[PDB]
Design a protein around this ligand. Structure first.
Ligand SMILES: CCNC(=O)[C@H](Cc1ccc(C#Cc2ccc3nccnc3c2)cc1)NC(=O)c1ccc2nc(C)c(C)nc2c1
Lengths: 276, 977
């Protein structure tokens, strides 16, 4: 009741690497904790990972003379008794600055009730079919990302082209003001004398500037419309990836959960490796 | 690319329309290669058939201004430039009267070409920090320039030809045994001006003799302050007063049993080539508050409307904003969240409250926030997926707490990231204003809050305030690797004995993690210990520069250790990681940037690689501006090397453009059509002149000569890599080599391969000094852009696949080795294949590089073995010993009973001695990977990836225990042996 073997404890997880511990405590509430074997692998260490203040603490359960504890006085019969003492009380007694009541242990049994088809045959088919779903979904996501990155580059060079078009149009526009102002003092002299050749050439080529400048504006106009069309598709490509990412993550975790479940139950992965 | 927008083809004759000052328009048909000087001459004698001419009054006083492809209106002051290379946006050229300095504008055109962006871009930024950095970084540029010109033209030479020496004057014992009485036979080559006739010299001199007596003693055999010593071949000179064996070239000859041949060159001749350093300050160089500790209120941030988020209204139920104050990577409090709102009206008119008081905010605090979308479906499941992220510094570079409204642009989520927040990221707004935008508003205190200066912190510290037998625990903690787990009992133990840790300077990184950073009382005390801390080795002080130690004072102390201990020999080795650390700096004006820039402006070998490492990372939009400002400052004061860097950049651009057509346009064709097409587009003068007569980016000492179009094909591997072949311009080419072969890859990431080739070099240096003769061949690799790089080619190397195909079993590799070298050299060739084979077994297993086959394993005719094509590492214990049966025959000298042979037993011994040697240096390798987390490699996202090294090296186990872990792995792969 109060004190059974540490093996049959919902919070004890055995031997899990610190990489696995962090992912289980990630984005969890304050007070969540789980016991596990120490990194050194020496018998009787039982590091107690704790989550307080957004940080994942780490407290080692020292062992000496068949007794366990945190400080040098090991006044506890076993790990279960020691943890249970702090499950109903805060750790301020152990450390003045450490305030937590070890509320929410990460029970290993809860994840158990997520897998069905306890028989080997059914799990083999589900995991194999899930890998096809996970692999197909991942491939589809991979295709979108390359399109998303590719489309990002295309729009960037479209923005620069429009930026350059502003400079070119500005030069022609500015020169028109300068050209018109320049043709102000000699225009009267041309009108005074009957020289039609100068008028035709001045007007003929002056319109050429208008024609050339008009073409520049039209060319820029098409680019802006193309940029708008390209930009809209850029968001649509982004929309698909945003809605595919959450589904891919869930499939990957569920697929991994089945894979570990099969291996843990005394099954060599060589048979599963060919199953894929 | 190309010579015009969109159209990369340049017709020989094009109707180029100019704009004369009088507002006139006239069309011209110039040449593609015609210089702008000629264009002006022809253009001016073409207006006589036009309305007005009196305004011209001369042919000069006009600059031919126009627009470029970078959206920049270039001035074209250098009229000698050809119209082809002007990068015109559209055919047109406006004639304008000269304006500006006319000399500083020319430089800005060369600086822009090298950096890749117009220099005017930095001048259009209104950010006060961007402009302040530009005007302040010129102090380091000026100091370095003055430093170079201190003694004489000699000081100028040492800048352009930095001696490549080693920080190890004493030779390893085993190599010293290679010298008969500590003397090395060297042949000195002296060239006589009449007919340029060669000459010989046999010299037997002591290893520990500087070039001064080498040169003088050689004169006695001829039968002063001149006649410098140069390496026959590449540009490498023996100038500084060092022991002869101290240099890298002479040491390499000793290790490989070769007689170094050197050239005698007159000193005056070398100084003639040295140009003058003309560094002129640019135009931009000439152009109350209450302490933070008195503000009593919790840090409160108000969120507001998000401009827009790309989320489907039906796929995702609701969205919310997650925030949290971080210091480095560790939060300073619990992450706060905003009320979930439908993803159609992201209003969030909410005040966020944090559990941290304002006075307790560390100077390096950041506000990491992100937009997360909660699914809230699947019955009893709640999945959060980030939509964007953005970091905000709480103190601008002036030590002022951010106050008032502020608009922040979010970043796209990195690939393969699932954490809601991204604390390890660049703290700034997205330059692309067309992304999600989050509006924040920090509360106003009726005044500007300034972080207390140094004096105030000192008063608070030491104001609130013998030996111990159990000091062995402090010693034990120091040796633990950086990634090791530290318990709360040790954290509370290091801090209590912080004053006794000064006697163990190696414990500083561990004592920096035991201090609560959200408590000004504890942080104040720490600043005192760091102030008067003993200096540590650069290897240990290099780990205080990564993302785990963001305090400005902690990083400043680390840099001061680099300055006084980091030799230019080691600086060039770790320079790959030091550049990456520049992305972890909070602000643009750091102490590391001033240290890095001072070294680049003093050494031309460091500057060469400093330029290329920064340049290759300019495609990233996160560090595009930070590195762009860093390159512009260097390019302005780099001196006359910018002319050489223009040849390389221009040359590399031709290959990139050419290589993009063989994989984009002519990709669905045969192998002979591509080769003829590739050969066709190399005889053109534009391509021919650009790809000749410039230094090789991989090794600046190698000046690439005339191209050899006959022997340049397309590698039938990867994605059409291009096998380019060059010549050796110097007359002394046959001594070293007569061909510089370089593989130009365009489409493969060369950063994983560039980092592996550097870990191999460090591994081989550890074993060389220890005593082991494990010889590896870490060829030269370099990344010059986005998934484009160059690879050096090793001479006379065939893959194991080639021999099997050409040798046609299991004795083909051994049979070929026997045929190539028969006689007394067979034993050496069999022992070189053994030492080389053993070295790559330990290195390959530790790093877990991609699986090897007979296609990416090369064996030289001398018997040496080396690996190529380093695909991936650490991802793709669970990796076996790559040794295969094809090598046991060679190891056992052809014996069939290889399993329990005497030769094989010696092979196992050298594998254990190599494995244990690296295990004792695991700290160095853990720190190298810890400085590349932000690099962006797909397999180096976080410290989780680096956990592979801690497992293959068996760091937690015992030294004796770790040995049998390697034993089990080696036997398991071979199923015994
Ligand atoms: C079934 C079809 N088979 C082939 O067609 C073979 C296979 C084959 C040969 C050789 C390497 C190789 C290599 C290599 C790769 C990376 C390296 N990294 C560092 C150092 N050395 C390295 C050497 C691979 C593969 N021929 C080529 O593909 C080929 C193409 C162009 C060439 N052009 C020149 C100028 C020369 C000298 N040979 C060429 C060889």
């Amino acid at each position: 009741n109060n004190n059974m073997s540490l093996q049959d404890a919902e919070w004890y997880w055995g031997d899990i690497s610190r990489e696995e511990v962090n992912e289980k405590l990630r984005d969890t509430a304050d007070g969540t904790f789980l016991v596990r074997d120490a990194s050194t692998k020496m018998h009787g260490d039982y590091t107690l990972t704790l989550r307080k203040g957004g940080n994942n603490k780490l407290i080692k359960i020292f062992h000496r003379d068949g007794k366990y504890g945190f400080s040098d006085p090991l006044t506890f019969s076993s790990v279960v008794e020691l943890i249970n003492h702090y499950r109903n009380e805060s750790l301020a007694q152990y450390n003045p600055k450490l305030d937590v009541k070890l509320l929410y242990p990460v029970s290993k049994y809860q994840q158990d009730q997520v897998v069905k088809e306890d028989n080997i045959e059914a799990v083999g088919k589900k995991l194999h079919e899930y890998n096809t779903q996970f692999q197909e979904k991942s491939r589809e996501y991979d295709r979108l990302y390359e399109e998303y990155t590719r489309t990002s580059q295309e729009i960037q060079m479209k923005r620069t082209a429009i930026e350059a078009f502003n400079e070119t149009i500005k030069i022609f526009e500015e020169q028109c003001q300068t050209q018109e102002r320049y043709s102000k003092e000699y225009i009267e002299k041309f009108k005074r004398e009957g020289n039609e050749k100068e008028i035709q050439r001045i007007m003929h080529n002056y319109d050429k500037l208008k024609s050339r400048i008009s073409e520049i504006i039209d060319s820029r106009r098409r680019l802006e419309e193309d940029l708008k069309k390209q930009a809209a598709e850029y968001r649509e490509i982004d929309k698909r990836m945003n809605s595919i990412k959450p589904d891919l993550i869930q499939l990957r975790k569920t697929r991994d959960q089945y894979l570990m479940w099969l291996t843990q139950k005394g099954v060599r992965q060589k048979k599963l490796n060919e199953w894929l | 690319s190309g010579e015009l927008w969109g159209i990369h083809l340049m017709p020989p004759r094009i109707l180029v329309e100019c704009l004369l000052p009088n507002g006139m328009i006239v069309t011209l048909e110039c040449l593609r290669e015609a210089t702008l000087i000629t264009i002006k001459h022809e253009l001016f004698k073409e207006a006589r058939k036009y309305p007005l001419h009196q305004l011209l009054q001369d042919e000069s006083s006009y600059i031919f201004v126009s627009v470029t492809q970078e959206a920049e209106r270039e001035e074209f002051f250098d009229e000698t430039r050809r119209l082809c290379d002007l990068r015109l946006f559209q055919p047109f050229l406006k004639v304008i009267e000269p304006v500006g300095n006319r000399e500083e504008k020319i430089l800005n055109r060369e600086i822009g070409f090298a950096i890749g962006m117009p220099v005017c871009e930095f001048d259009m930024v209104k950010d006060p920090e961007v402009q302040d950095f530009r005007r302040n970084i010129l102090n380091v540029c000026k100091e370095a320039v003055d430093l170079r010109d201190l003694n004489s033209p000699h000081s100028r030479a040492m800048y352009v030809y930095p001696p490549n020496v080693e920080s190890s004057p004493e030779l390893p014992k085993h190599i010293y045994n290679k010298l008969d009485k500590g003397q090395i036979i060297v042949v000195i080559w002296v060239i006589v001006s009449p007919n340029n006739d060669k000459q010989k010299y046999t010299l037997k001199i002591n290893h520990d003799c500087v070039p001064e007596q080498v040169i003088a003693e050689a004169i006695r055999k001829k039968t002063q302050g001149k006649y410098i010593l140069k390496v026959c071949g590449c540009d490498e000179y023996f100038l500084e007063k060092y022991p002869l064996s101290q240099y890298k070239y002479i040491r390499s000859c000793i290790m490989l049993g070769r007689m170094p041949n050197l050239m005698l060159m007159a000193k005056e001749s070398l100084y003639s080539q040295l140009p003058m350093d003309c560094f002129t300050m640019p135009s931009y160089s000439r152009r109350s508050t209450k302490s933070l500790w008195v503000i009593n209120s919790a840090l409160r941030i108000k969120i507001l409307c998000a401009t827009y988020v790309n989320v489907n209204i039906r796929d995702i139920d609701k969205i919310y904003v997650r925030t949290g104050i971080y210091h480095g990577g560790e939060p300073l409090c619990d992450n706060v969240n905003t009320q979930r709102v439908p993803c159609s009206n992201p209003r969030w008119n909410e005040w966020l409250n944090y559990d941290i008081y304002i006075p307790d905010l560390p100077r390096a605090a950041r506000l990491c926030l992100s937009i997360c979308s909660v699914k809230g479906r699947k019955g009893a499941k709640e999945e959060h997926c980030p939509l964007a992220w953005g970091n905000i510094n709480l103190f601008d570079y002036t030590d002022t707490l951010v106050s008032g409204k502020m608009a922040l642009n979010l970043w796209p989520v990195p690939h393969g990231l699932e954490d809601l927040l991204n604390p390890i990221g660049v703290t700034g707004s997205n330059p692309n204003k067309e992304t999600p935008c989050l509006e924040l508003e920090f509360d106003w205190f009726s005044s500007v809050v300034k972080f207390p200066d140094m004096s105030v912190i000192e008063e608070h510290a030491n104001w609130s305030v013998l030996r111990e037998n159990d000091k062995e625990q402090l010693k034990a903690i120091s040796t633990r690797d950086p990634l090791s787990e530290i318990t709360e009992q040790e954290k509370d133990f290091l801090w209590s004995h912080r004053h006794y840790c000064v006697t163990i300077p190696e414990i500083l990184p561990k004592l920096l993690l035991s201090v609560k950073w959200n408590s000004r009382d504890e942080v104040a005390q720490m600043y005192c210990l760091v102030k008067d801390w003993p200096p540590i080795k650069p290897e240990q002080a290099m780990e205080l520069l990564d993302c785990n130690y963001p305090d400005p004072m902690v990083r400043g102390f680390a840099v001061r250790c680099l300055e006084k201990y980091l030799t230019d020999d080691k600086l060039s080795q770790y320079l790959i990681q030091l550049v990456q650390v520049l992305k972890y700096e909070q602000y643009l004006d750091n102490l590391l940037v001033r240290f890095l820039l001072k070294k680049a402006l003093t050494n031309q070998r460091i500057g060469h690689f400093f330029f290329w490492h920064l340049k290759s990372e300019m495609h990233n939009k996160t560090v595009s501006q930070r590195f762009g400002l860093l390159l512009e400052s260097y390019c302005r004061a780099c001196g006359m090397y910018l002319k050489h860097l223009n040849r390389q950049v221009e040359a590399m651009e031709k290959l990139i453009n050419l290589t993009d057509i063989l994989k984009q346009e002519k990709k669905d064709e045969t192998q002979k059509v591509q080769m003829k097409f590739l050969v066709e587009q190399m005889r053109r003068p534009d391509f021919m002149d650009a790809l000749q007569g410039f230094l090789s980016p991989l090794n600046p000492a190698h000046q690439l000569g005339n191209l050899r179009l006959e022997e340049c094909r397309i590698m039938s591997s990867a994605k059409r890599p291009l096998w380019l072949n060059w010549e050796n311009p110097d007359i002394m080419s046959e001594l070293l080599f007569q061909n510089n072969e370089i593989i130009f890859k365009n489409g493969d990431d060369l950063r994983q391969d560039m980092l592996t080739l550097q870990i191999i070099r460090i591994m081989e240096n550890i074993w060389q000094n220890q005593g082991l003769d494990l010889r590896m061949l870490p060829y030269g690799c370099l990344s010059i852009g986005d998934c484009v790089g160059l690879i050096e080619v090793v001479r006379n190397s065939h893959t194991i696949m080639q021999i099997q195909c050409k040798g046609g079993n299991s004795h083909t590799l051994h049979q070929w080795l026997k045929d190539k070298n028969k006689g007394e050299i067979y034993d050496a060739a069999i022992d070189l294949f053994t030492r080389s084979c053993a070295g790559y077994c330990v290195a390959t297993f530790i790093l877990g590089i991609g699986d090897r086959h007979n296609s990416n394993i090369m064996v030289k005719d001398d018997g040496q073995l080396f690996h190529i094509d380093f695909g991936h590492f650490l991802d793709h214990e669970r990796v076996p010993f790559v040794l295969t049966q094809d090598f046991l025959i060679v190891i056992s000298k052809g014996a069939q009973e290889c399993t329990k042979t005497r030769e094989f037993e010696r092979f196992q011994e050298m594998c254990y001695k190599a494995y244990l040697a690296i295990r004792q240096h695991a700290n160095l390798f853990i720190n190298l990977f810890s400085m590349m987390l932000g690099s962006g490699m797909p397999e180096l996202q976080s410290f989780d990836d680096i956990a592979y090294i801690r497992k293959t090296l068996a760091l937690d186990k015992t030294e004796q225990e770790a040995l049998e872990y390697f034993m089990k792995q080696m036997n398991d792969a071979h199923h015994g042996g």
